[PDB]
Amino acid sequence: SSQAWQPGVAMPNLYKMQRMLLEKCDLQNYGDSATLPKGIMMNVAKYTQLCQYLNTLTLAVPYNMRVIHFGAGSDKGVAPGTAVLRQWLPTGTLLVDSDLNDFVSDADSTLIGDCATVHTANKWDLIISDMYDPKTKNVTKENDSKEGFFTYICGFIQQKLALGGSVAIKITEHSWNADLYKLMGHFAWWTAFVTNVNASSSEAFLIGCNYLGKPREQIDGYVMHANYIFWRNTNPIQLSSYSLFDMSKFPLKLRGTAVMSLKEGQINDMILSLLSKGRLIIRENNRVVISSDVLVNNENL
Protein backbone atom coordinates (compact mmCIF):
# COMPACT_ATOMS: atom_id res chain seq x y z
CA SER A 1 0.00 0.00 0.00
CA SER A 2 1.00 3.57 0.83
CA GLN A 3 3.15 1.70 3.36
CA ALA A 4 5.57 0.97 0.51
CA TRP A 5 6.72 4.61 0.54
CA GLN A 6 7.38 4.52 4.29
CA PRO A 7 10.69 3.26 5.70
CA GLY A 8 8.80 0.31 7.20
CA VAL A 9 5.74 -0.67 9.19
CA ALA A 10 5.18 -0.32 12.94
CA MET A 11 2.94 -2.76 14.88
CA PRO A 12 -0.63 -1.33 14.85
CA ASN A 13 -1.92 -0.59 18.35
CA LEU A 14 -4.89 -2.94 18.06
CA TYR A 15 -2.57 -5.93 17.67
CA LYS A 16 -0.70 -4.87 20.81
CA MET A 17 -3.92 -5.19 22.82
CA GLN A 18 -4.78 -8.74 21.81
CA ARG A 19 -4.27 -11.95 23.82
CA MET A 20 -2.95 -14.32 21.13
CA LEU A 21 -1.28 -17.69 21.64
CA LEU A 22 2.14 -18.13 20.12
CA GLU A 23 2.14 -19.75 16.69
CA LYS A 24 4.75 -20.45 14.05
CA CYS A 25 5.62 -17.48 11.83
CA ASP A 26 4.71 -18.18 8.19
CA LEU A 27 5.39 -15.13 6.01
CA GLN A 28 3.67 -14.97 2.63
CA ASN A 29 6.49 -12.91 1.09
CA TYR A 30 9.05 -15.31 2.59
CA GLY A 31 12.17 -15.71 0.48
CA ASP A 32 11.47 -12.65 -1.66
CA SER A 33 14.26 -10.05 -1.61
CA ALA A 34 14.06 -6.30 -2.08
CA THR A 35 16.03 -4.71 -4.92
CA LEU A 36 18.64 -2.56 -3.21
CA PRO A 37 20.17 0.55 -4.82
CA LYS A 38 23.36 -0.25 -6.73
CA GLY A 39 26.24 -1.20 -4.42
CA ILE A 40 24.29 -0.67 -1.17
CA MET A 41 24.57 -3.41 1.50
CA MET A 42 21.47 -4.81 3.20
CA ASN A 43 22.61 -3.64 6.62
CA VAL A 44 23.11 -0.07 5.39
CA ALA A 45 19.62 -0.11 3.85
CA LYS A 46 18.17 -1.64 6.99
CA TYR A 47 19.77 0.81 9.42
CA THR A 48 18.82 3.72 7.15
CA GLN A 49 15.16 2.72 7.29
CA LEU A 50 15.36 2.19 11.05
CA CYS A 51 16.82 5.66 11.46
CA GLN A 52 14.24 7.15 9.08
CA TYR A 53 11.53 5.66 11.32
CA LEU A 54 13.17 6.88 14.53
CA ASN A 55 13.12 10.40 13.06
CA THR A 56 9.33 10.23 13.46
CA LEU A 57 9.41 9.61 17.22
CA THR A 58 10.01 11.98 20.16
CA LEU A 59 13.63 11.01 20.75
CA ALA A 60 15.54 13.14 23.22
CA VAL A 61 18.61 14.55 21.47
CA PRO A 62 20.86 16.44 23.93
CA TYR A 63 24.21 18.09 23.46
CA ASN A 64 26.98 15.64 24.37
CA MET A 65 24.68 12.79 23.40
CA ARG A 66 25.91 9.24 24.11
CA VAL A 67 24.88 6.20 22.03
CA ILE A 68 25.99 2.57 22.40
CA HIS A 69 25.58 -0.03 19.62
CA PHE A 70 25.69 -3.78 20.40
CA GLY A 71 26.12 -6.47 17.78
CA ALA A 72 27.80 -4.00 15.43
CA GLY A 73 30.23 -6.30 13.61
CA SER A 74 29.52 -8.09 10.33
CA ASP A 75 30.93 -11.29 8.89
CA LYS A 76 32.74 -8.88 6.53
CA GLY A 77 34.73 -7.55 9.49
CA VAL A 78 33.32 -4.00 9.14
CA ALA A 79 30.43 -2.15 10.84
CA PRO A 80 27.87 -0.92 8.27
CA GLY A 81 25.23 -0.22 10.93
CA THR A 82 27.64 1.91 12.96
CA ALA A 83 28.45 3.91 9.83
CA VAL A 84 24.74 4.70 9.32
CA LEU A 85 24.23 5.57 12.99
CA ARG A 86 27.16 8.00 12.87
CA GLN A 87 25.78 9.55 9.68
CA TRP A 88 22.35 9.90 11.30
CA LEU A 89 23.41 11.15 14.73
CA PRO A 90 24.47 14.80 15.16
CA THR A 91 28.16 15.44 14.60
CA GLY A 92 30.09 15.00 17.83
CA THR A 93 27.69 12.42 19.27
CA LEU A 94 29.70 9.96 21.36
CA LEU A 95 29.24 6.54 19.69
CA VAL A 96 30.51 3.28 21.23
CA ASP A 97 30.02 -0.08 19.55
CA SER A 98 30.69 -3.71 20.43
CA ASP A 99 30.52 -7.28 19.14
CA LEU A 100 31.75 -10.76 19.96
CA ASN A 101 34.14 -10.88 17.00
CA ASP A 102 36.75 -8.37 15.84
CA PHE A 103 35.74 -5.75 13.26
CA VAL A 104 36.88 -2.31 12.11
CA SER A 105 34.56 0.54 12.94
CA ASP A 106 33.90 4.28 12.68
CA ALA A 107 32.70 4.41 16.30
CA ASP A 108 34.58 6.53 18.81
CA SER A 109 35.40 3.36 20.74
CA THR A 110 34.85 -0.33 20.05
CA LEU A 111 34.83 -3.18 22.61
CA ILE A 112 35.34 -6.75 21.36
CA GLY A 113 33.87 -9.61 23.34
CA ASP A 114 30.71 -11.04 24.81
CA CYS A 115 28.32 -8.19 25.59
CA ALA A 116 28.03 -9.39 29.19
CA THR A 117 31.68 -8.34 29.63
CA VAL A 118 30.88 -4.68 28.77
CA HIS A 119 30.63 -2.15 31.62
CA THR A 120 30.18 1.60 31.54
CA ALA A 121 30.54 4.24 34.23
CA ASN A 122 28.06 6.55 32.48
CA LYS A 123 24.43 6.35 31.37
CA TRP A 124 23.31 6.43 27.73
CA ASP A 125 20.74 8.37 25.71
CA LEU A 126 20.17 5.68 23.05
CA ILE A 127 20.91 1.94 22.96
CA ILE A 128 20.89 0.07 19.61
CA SER A 129 21.27 -3.71 19.45
CA ASP A 130 21.57 -5.88 16.35
CA MET A 131 22.83 -8.84 18.40
CA TYR A 132 21.64 -12.11 16.89
CA ASP A 133 22.54 -15.80 16.87
CA PRO A 134 21.33 -17.59 13.70
CA LYS A 135 21.20 -20.86 15.64
CA THR A 136 17.98 -19.67 17.33
CA LYS A 137 16.17 -20.12 13.99
CA ASN A 138 15.26 -23.75 14.72
CA VAL A 139 11.78 -24.53 13.41
CA THR A 140 11.90 -28.06 14.87
CA LYS A 141 11.92 -27.05 18.55
CA GLU A 142 9.63 -25.10 20.86
CA ASN A 143 10.05 -21.32 20.67
CA ASP A 144 10.67 -20.23 24.27
CA SER A 145 11.79 -16.88 25.61
CA LYS A 146 15.57 -16.60 25.14
CA GLU A 147 18.06 -15.48 27.77
CA GLY A 148 21.71 -14.98 26.82
CA PHE A 149 22.37 -11.43 25.60
CA PHE A 150 18.73 -10.49 26.22
CA THR A 151 19.27 -10.92 29.95
CA TYR A 152 22.23 -8.55 29.69
CA ILE A 153 20.26 -6.02 27.62
CA CYS A 154 17.38 -5.89 30.13
CA GLY A 155 19.75 -5.28 33.03
CA PHE A 156 21.76 -2.74 31.03
CA ILE A 157 18.66 -0.73 30.17
CA GLN A 158 17.48 -0.67 33.77
CA GLN A 159 20.92 0.27 35.08
CA LYS A 160 22.43 2.51 32.38
CA LEU A 161 19.72 4.04 30.16
CA ALA A 162 19.08 7.67 31.06
CA LEU A 163 15.52 8.60 31.90
CA GLY A 164 14.16 10.00 28.65
CA GLY A 165 16.43 7.77 26.56
CA SER A 166 15.29 5.27 23.93
CA VAL A 167 16.23 1.83 22.62
CA ALA A 168 15.94 -0.19 19.42
CA ILE A 169 16.62 -3.94 19.95
CA LYS A 170 16.53 -6.42 17.05
CA ILE A 171 14.30 -9.47 17.58
CA THR A 172 12.97 -12.20 15.29
CA GLU A 173 10.41 -14.98 15.57
CA HIS A 174 12.88 -17.06 17.59
CA SER A 175 15.27 -14.36 18.91
CA TRP A 176 13.23 -12.65 21.64
CA ASN A 177 12.82 -12.29 25.38
CA ALA A 178 9.68 -11.91 27.47
CA ASP A 179 11.24 -9.52 30.02
CA LEU A 180 12.35 -7.21 27.23
CA TYR A 181 8.75 -6.83 26.06
CA LYS A 182 7.71 -6.31 29.67
CA LEU A 183 10.36 -3.61 29.93
CA MET A 184 8.78 -1.85 27.00
CA GLY A 185 6.01 -0.92 29.46
CA HIS A 186 8.60 1.27 31.25
CA PHE A 187 8.78 3.67 28.30
CA ALA A 188 6.29 6.39 27.39
CA TRP A 189 5.65 4.54 24.12
CA TRP A 190 6.86 1.39 22.36
CA THR A 191 6.45 -0.50 19.12
CA ALA A 192 7.86 -3.30 16.99
CA PHE A 193 9.15 -1.84 13.70
CA VAL A 194 9.72 -3.85 10.51
CA THR A 195 11.93 -2.31 7.85
CA ASN A 196 10.50 -2.39 4.34
CA VAL A 197 13.78 -3.67 2.86
CA ASN A 198 13.68 -6.77 5.12
CA ALA A 199 9.89 -7.25 5.28
CA SER A 200 10.16 -10.89 4.23
CA SER A 201 11.91 -11.69 7.53
CA SER A 202 10.28 -12.08 10.95
CA GLU A 203 12.93 -9.61 12.14
CA ALA A 204 11.75 -6.43 13.86
CA PHE A 205 13.24 -3.72 16.06
CA LEU A 206 11.58 -3.48 19.47
CA ILE A 207 11.60 0.29 20.08
CA GLY A 208 11.14 1.82 23.51
CA CYS A 209 10.64 5.59 23.31
CA ASN A 210 11.47 7.82 26.33
CA TYR A 211 12.42 5.66 29.32
CA LEU A 212 10.48 6.35 32.52
CA GLY A 213 12.39 4.05 34.87
CA LYS A 214 9.16 2.48 36.17
CA PRO A 215 6.14 0.66 34.70
CA ARG A 216 3.63 2.80 32.91
CA GLU A 217 1.94 -0.43 31.85
CA GLN A 218 2.14 -4.08 32.88
CA ILE A 219 3.00 -6.15 29.80
CA ASP A 220 3.04 -9.93 29.67
CA GLY A 221 5.95 -10.54 27.32
CA TYR A 222 4.95 -14.07 26.29
CA VAL A 223 1.56 -12.75 25.17
CA MET A 224 3.06 -9.67 23.49
CA HIS A 225 5.39 -11.75 21.36
CA ALA A 226 2.47 -13.94 20.35
CA ASN A 227 0.66 -10.70 19.43
CA TYR A 228 3.66 -9.62 17.35
CA ILE A 229 3.74 -12.92 15.46
CA PHE A 230 -0.01 -12.81 14.86
CA TRP A 231 0.41 -9.37 13.30
CA ARG A 232 3.25 -10.58 11.08
CA ASN A 233 1.33 -13.77 10.20
CA THR A 234 -1.75 -11.87 9.02
CA ASN A 235 -0.26 -8.68 7.50
CA PRO A 236 2.03 -9.35 4.54
CA ILE A 237 4.39 -6.42 4.06
CA GLN A 238 5.40 -5.49 0.52
CA LEU A 239 9.18 -5.43 0.12
CA SER A 240 10.25 -1.89 -0.69
CA SER A 241 13.41 0.21 -0.99
CA TYR A 242 11.61 3.44 -1.96
CA SER A 243 12.48 5.42 1.17
CA LEU A 244 16.22 4.89 0.53
CA PHE A 245 16.06 7.25 -2.45
CA ASP A 246 15.09 10.37 -0.41
CA MET A 247 17.85 11.24 2.04
CA SER A 248 17.25 15.00 2.25
CA LYS A 249 15.65 14.88 5.70
CA PHE A 250 17.72 12.00 7.11
CA PRO A 251 19.95 13.66 9.75
CA LEU A 252 18.60 13.55 13.29
CA LYS A 253 17.86 17.12 14.38
CA LEU A 254 20.09 18.25 17.25
CA ARG A 255 17.24 19.32 19.55
CA GLY A 256 19.57 20.32 22.40
CA THR A 257 17.26 18.51 24.83
CA ALA A 258 17.92 19.48 28.43
CA VAL A 259 19.97 17.16 30.67
CA MET A 260 19.54 17.32 34.44
CA SER A 261 20.83 15.22 37.30
CA LEU A 262 18.04 14.28 39.69
CA LYS A 263 17.53 11.84 42.55
CA GLU A 264 14.63 9.38 42.48
CA GLY A 265 12.83 11.49 45.08
CA GLN A 266 12.67 14.48 42.71
CA ILE A 267 10.96 12.68 39.80
CA ASN A 268 7.46 14.15 40.12
CA ASP A 269 4.56 14.06 37.65
CA MET A 270 5.76 17.21 35.90
CA ILE A 271 9.22 15.69 35.32
CA LEU A 272 7.61 12.44 34.17
CA SER A 273 5.53 14.48 31.72
CA LEU A 274 8.61 16.17 30.26
CA LEU A 275 10.36 12.81 30.00
CA SER A 276 7.38 11.37 28.15
CA LYS A 277 7.48 14.15 25.53
CA GLY A 278 11.13 13.84 24.55
CA ARG A 279 11.91 17.11 26.37
CA LEU A 280 14.23 15.95 29.17
CA ILE A 281 17.12 13.56 29.82
CA ILE A 282 18.03 12.64 33.41
CA ARG A 283 21.61 11.51 34.02
CA GLU A 284 24.97 12.79 35.11
CA ASN A 285 26.93 14.66 32.44
CA ASN A 286 30.39 13.33 33.37
CA ARG A 287 33.00 11.70 31.15
CA VAL A 288 32.15 8.58 29.17
CA VAL A 289 34.22 5.64 30.45
CA ILE A 290 33.82 2.03 29.32
CA SER A 291 35.54 -1.30 29.81
CA SER A 292 35.46 -4.96 28.80
CA ASP A 293 36.13 -7.71 31.35
CA VAL A 294 38.86 -10.09 30.16
CA LEU A 295 39.17 -13.66 31.46
CA VAL A 296 42.82 -14.54 32.05
CA ASN A 297 44.07 -18.09 31.53
CA ASN A 298 47.52 -19.70 31.44
CA GLU A 299 47.17 -23.05 29.65
CA ASN A 300 50.90 -23.86 29.59
CA LEU A 301 52.01 -27.43 30.45
Binding site: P37, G39, I40, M41, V44, A45, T48, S74, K76, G77, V78, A79, P80, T82, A83, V84, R86, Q87, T91, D102, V104, S105, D106, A107, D108, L244, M247, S248, F250, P251
Partner: protein, 116 residues
Amino acid sequence: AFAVDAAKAYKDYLASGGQPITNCVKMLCTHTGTGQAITVTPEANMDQESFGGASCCLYCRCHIDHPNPKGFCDLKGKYVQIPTTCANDPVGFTLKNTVCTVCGMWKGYGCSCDQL
Protein backbone atom coordinates in the same frame (compact mmCIF):
# COMPACT_ATOMS: atom_id res chain seq x y z
CA ALA B 1 65.03 -0.60 10.19
CA PHE B 2 62.47 -3.22 9.07
CA ALA B 3 58.79 -2.30 8.75
CA VAL B 4 56.20 -3.88 6.46
CA ASP B 5 55.28 -1.66 3.49
CA ALA B 6 51.59 -2.45 3.13
CA ALA B 7 50.94 0.47 0.78
CA LYS B 8 53.58 -0.69 -1.69
CA ALA B 9 52.32 -4.25 -1.30
CA TYR B 10 48.76 -3.25 -2.21
CA LYS B 11 49.92 -1.11 -5.14
CA ASP B 12 52.05 -3.96 -6.52
CA TYR B 13 49.19 -6.40 -5.91
CA LEU B 14 46.79 -4.20 -7.88
CA ALA B 15 49.25 -3.65 -10.74
CA SER B 16 49.73 -7.41 -10.99
CA GLY B 17 45.96 -7.72 -11.45
CA GLY B 18 44.65 -8.50 -7.95
CA GLN B 19 41.01 -7.88 -7.06
CA PRO B 20 40.56 -4.64 -5.06
CA ILE B 21 39.61 -4.88 -1.41
CA THR B 22 35.83 -5.26 -1.15
CA ASN B 23 33.11 -4.54 1.44
CA CYS B 24 33.87 -0.87 1.78
CA VAL B 25 30.73 0.55 3.38
CA LYS B 26 28.90 2.73 0.85
CA MET B 27 26.37 5.19 2.30
CA LEU B 28 23.02 6.42 1.07
CA CYS B 29 23.04 10.18 0.62
CA THR B 30 21.58 12.91 -1.60
CA HIS B 31 24.68 13.27 -3.79
CA THR B 32 24.19 17.04 -3.53
CA GLY B 33 27.10 17.57 -1.12
CA THR B 34 30.24 19.67 -1.21
CA GLY B 35 32.41 17.03 -2.88
CA GLN B 36 35.19 17.49 -0.33
CA ALA B 37 37.38 14.43 0.17
CA ILE B 38 36.99 13.55 3.88
CA THR B 39 34.10 14.91 5.91
CA VAL B 40 32.23 14.44 9.18
CA THR B 41 29.12 13.37 7.25
CA PRO B 42 28.63 12.07 3.69
CA GLU B 43 29.26 14.88 1.19
CA ALA B 44 29.24 13.13 -2.21
CA ASN B 45 28.26 15.27 -5.15
CA MET B 46 26.73 13.87 -8.35
CA ASP B 47 30.15 12.52 -9.46
CA GLN B 48 30.99 10.68 -6.21
CA GLU B 49 30.03 7.95 -3.77
CA SER B 50 30.38 8.38 -0.01
CA PHE B 51 31.88 5.56 2.09
CA GLY B 52 32.36 4.95 5.78
CA GLY B 53 35.95 6.03 6.33
CA ALA B 54 37.38 3.14 8.37
CA SER B 55 36.23 0.60 5.78
CA CYS B 56 38.28 2.41 3.08
CA CYS B 57 41.53 2.64 5.08
CA LEU B 58 44.21 0.13 4.15
CA TYR B 59 45.68 0.15 7.67
CA CYS B 60 42.31 -0.25 9.40
CA ARG B 61 41.25 -3.02 7.00
CA CYS B 62 44.54 -4.93 7.23
CA HIS B 63 44.83 -4.65 11.04
CA ILE B 64 48.20 -2.89 10.87
CA ASP B 65 49.66 0.22 12.46
CA HIS B 66 49.03 3.52 10.85
CA PRO B 67 51.91 5.52 9.30
CA ASN B 68 51.10 8.53 11.52
CA PRO B 69 53.66 8.53 14.38
CA LYS B 70 50.85 8.79 16.96
CA GLY B 71 49.02 6.08 14.98
CA PHE B 72 46.11 8.40 14.11
CA CYS B 73 43.77 7.61 11.19
CA ASP B 74 42.66 10.27 8.71
CA LEU B 75 39.59 8.26 7.71
CA LYS B 76 38.19 6.36 10.70
CA GLY B 77 35.07 8.02 12.07
CA LYS B 78 34.59 10.20 8.97
CA TYR B 79 33.24 9.70 5.44
CA VAL B 80 35.32 9.62 2.28
CA GLN B 81 34.03 10.78 -1.11
CA ILE B 82 35.28 8.58 -3.97
CA PRO B 83 34.84 9.47 -7.67
CA THR B 84 32.18 7.13 -9.05
CA THR B 85 34.63 6.02 -11.75
CA CYS B 86 37.04 4.86 -9.00
CA ALA B 87 34.45 3.46 -6.56
CA ASN B 88 35.41 -0.11 -7.47
CA ASP B 89 38.56 0.34 -5.32
CA PRO B 90 38.06 2.93 -2.58
CA VAL B 91 41.06 1.64 -0.60
CA GLY B 92 43.34 2.00 -3.61
CA PHE B 93 41.92 5.45 -4.29
CA THR B 94 42.45 6.80 -0.78
CA LEU B 95 45.93 5.30 -0.70
CA LYS B 96 47.12 6.67 -4.07
CA ASN B 97 45.69 10.19 -3.82
CA THR B 98 46.08 13.24 -1.59
CA VAL B 99 43.72 15.88 -0.24
CA CYS B 100 44.37 19.57 -0.92
CA THR B 101 45.05 21.18 2.46
CA VAL B 102 43.52 24.46 1.21
CA CYS B 103 40.14 23.60 -0.32
CA GLY B 104 39.69 20.03 0.94
CA MET B 105 39.04 18.43 -2.46
CA TRP B 106 41.12 15.57 -3.79
CA LYS B 107 44.15 16.81 -5.71
CA GLY B 108 43.25 16.14 -9.32
CA TYR B 109 39.64 15.16 -8.52
CA GLY B 110 38.05 18.45 -7.55
CA CYS B 111 40.88 20.70 -6.40
CA SER B 112 41.10 23.70 -8.73
CA CYS B 113 43.48 25.77 -6.58
CA ASP B 114 46.15 25.47 -9.31
CA GLN B 115 44.14 27.10 -12.11
CA LEU B 116 43.19 30.72 -11.24
